């Protein structure tokens, strides 16, 4: 009866916006199971001087479209089921911006806060050593994801260079590394640049000007940091409203990005900013501004606090803010929201140009990401916003038929799929 599971449940997405789309039934089976999991044992040894065996996966969803892609989580609640879902909601995510790309995950059940700086050496090499057979440039690329970091993907490449003896292109088998190893200019602004990009493609479509208006951004980790501040300088808005775990903050005369973040920096916290006015996170949601944008956390906007929104744009750059109970009430208001997988898609876009710079060699700068990086976006989110105004759908089912029916159109050419 009572039971949670995720991959169940990131199969049941896939089984609801399966009507919206004409797609055989041969295909749909063969969308539900990943196509190789390989789960291994990997052995360190400790500083004591004693071994110990840890639990390692690498779910690879669906190669149809070109080589898998996707992160490496180091967490202690990992199951085979929590990187089967992610797996799986990868592939609708290297899509919708059009990639050569598959889904894929993979993942470590340990502890990291309790492991030195050598002993996650250790672990990080010897996890390439046994999964050496599946990954590769051109087979499967990972990634850096939740407690991982830029400085671990260095070393796994190390490993992976060693035993491939150099015979190939050894600096494009993992992304999210360095820059003087072989990583890419403009990667921390990556997941805000995206949204920007769709923010500003939205009130255009939506016939809304935008100097002079009002954003509020819940949570200010990285990533709802750079979309407070490229708002201000990029677009022409006004940041109101900030808040992080603890409370939030308020002044409609304008909170000046940069400045959050060194209070923030010295304390831990924004309460009691100078010049502003306190409030709760709670009463973020219920302003009334121009664009919302939930960056912190899921399950923010459900049943009760749908109907007290008053904003025009709400663009989810977290991962699955907003419950469909909530999508029903919103939309008949007449609110724009821009999906999850679609509004911070620039984590993988600008994570495919280092893996096409390491592959060619000629390294690209700093502008010509950025103007690159408009390019996809762009052109992304207006394959989503017009296939929205033909069948009459809400905004996050139309995103996954476009990103359903290039991977069975894969399918269907590459003669996996007969009908």
Not at 163 to 186: E, H
Not at 204 to 229: F, H, P
Request: charged share 25%; glycine share 8%.
């Amino acid at each position: 009866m009572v039971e949670i599971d995720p991959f169940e449940m990131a199969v049941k997405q896939l089984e609801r916006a399966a009507q919206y789309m004409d797609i055989s039934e041969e295909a749909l089976e063969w969308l539900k199971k990943p196509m190789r999991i390989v789960e291994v044992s990997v052995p360190i040894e400790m500083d004591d001087g004693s071994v110990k065996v840890f639990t390692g996966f690498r779910v690879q969803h669906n190669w149809a479209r070109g080589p898998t892609k996707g992160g490496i989580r180091w967490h202690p609640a990992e199951t085979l089921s929590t990187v089967k879902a992610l797996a799986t909601w990868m592939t609708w995510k290297v899509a919708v911006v059009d990639l050569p790309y598959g889904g894929g995950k993979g993942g470590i059940i340990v502890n990291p806060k309790e492991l030195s700086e050598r002993e996650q050496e250790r672990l990080a090499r010897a996890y390439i050593r046994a999964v050496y057979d599946v990954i590769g440039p051109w087979t499967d690329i990972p990634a850096p994801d939740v407690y991982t970091n830029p400085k671990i993907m260095g070393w796994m490449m190390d490993e992976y260079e060693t035993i491939m003896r150099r015979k190939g292109p050894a600096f494009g088998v993992i992304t999210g590394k360095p820059l003087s190893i072989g990583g890419s200019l403009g990667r921390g602004t990556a997941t805000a640049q995206g949204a920007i990009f769709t923010i500003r493609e939205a009130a255009k479509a939506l016939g809304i000007d935008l100097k002079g208006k009002k954003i509020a951004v819940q949570g200010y980790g990285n990533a709802g940091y750079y979309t407070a501040k490229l708002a201000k300088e990029q677009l022409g808005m006004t940041v109101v409203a900030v808040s992080d775990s603890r409370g939030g903050i308020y002044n409609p005369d304008g909170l000046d990005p940069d400045e959050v973040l060194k209070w923030k920096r010295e304390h831990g916290s924004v309460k009691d900013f100078p010049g502003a006015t306190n409030i709760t996170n709670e009463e973020l949601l219920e302003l009334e501004v121009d664009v919302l944008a939930p960056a912190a956390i899921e399950e923010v906007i459900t049943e009760k606090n749908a109907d007290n929104i008053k904003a025009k744009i709400v663009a989810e750059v977290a991962n699955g803010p907003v419950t469909p109970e909530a999508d029903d009430i919103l939309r008949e208001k007449g609110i724009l929201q821009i999906p999850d997988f679609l509004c911070n898609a620039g984590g993988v876009t600008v994570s495919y140009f280092e893996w096409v710079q390491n592959i060619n060699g000629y390294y690209w700068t700093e502008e010509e990401v950025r103007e690159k990086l408009d390019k996809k976006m762009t052109k992304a989110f207006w394959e989503v916003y017009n296939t929205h105004k033909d069948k009459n759908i809400h905004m996050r089912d139309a995103a996954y038929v476009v990103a359903v029916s290039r991977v069975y159109q894969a399918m269907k050419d590459r003669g996996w799929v007969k009908k």
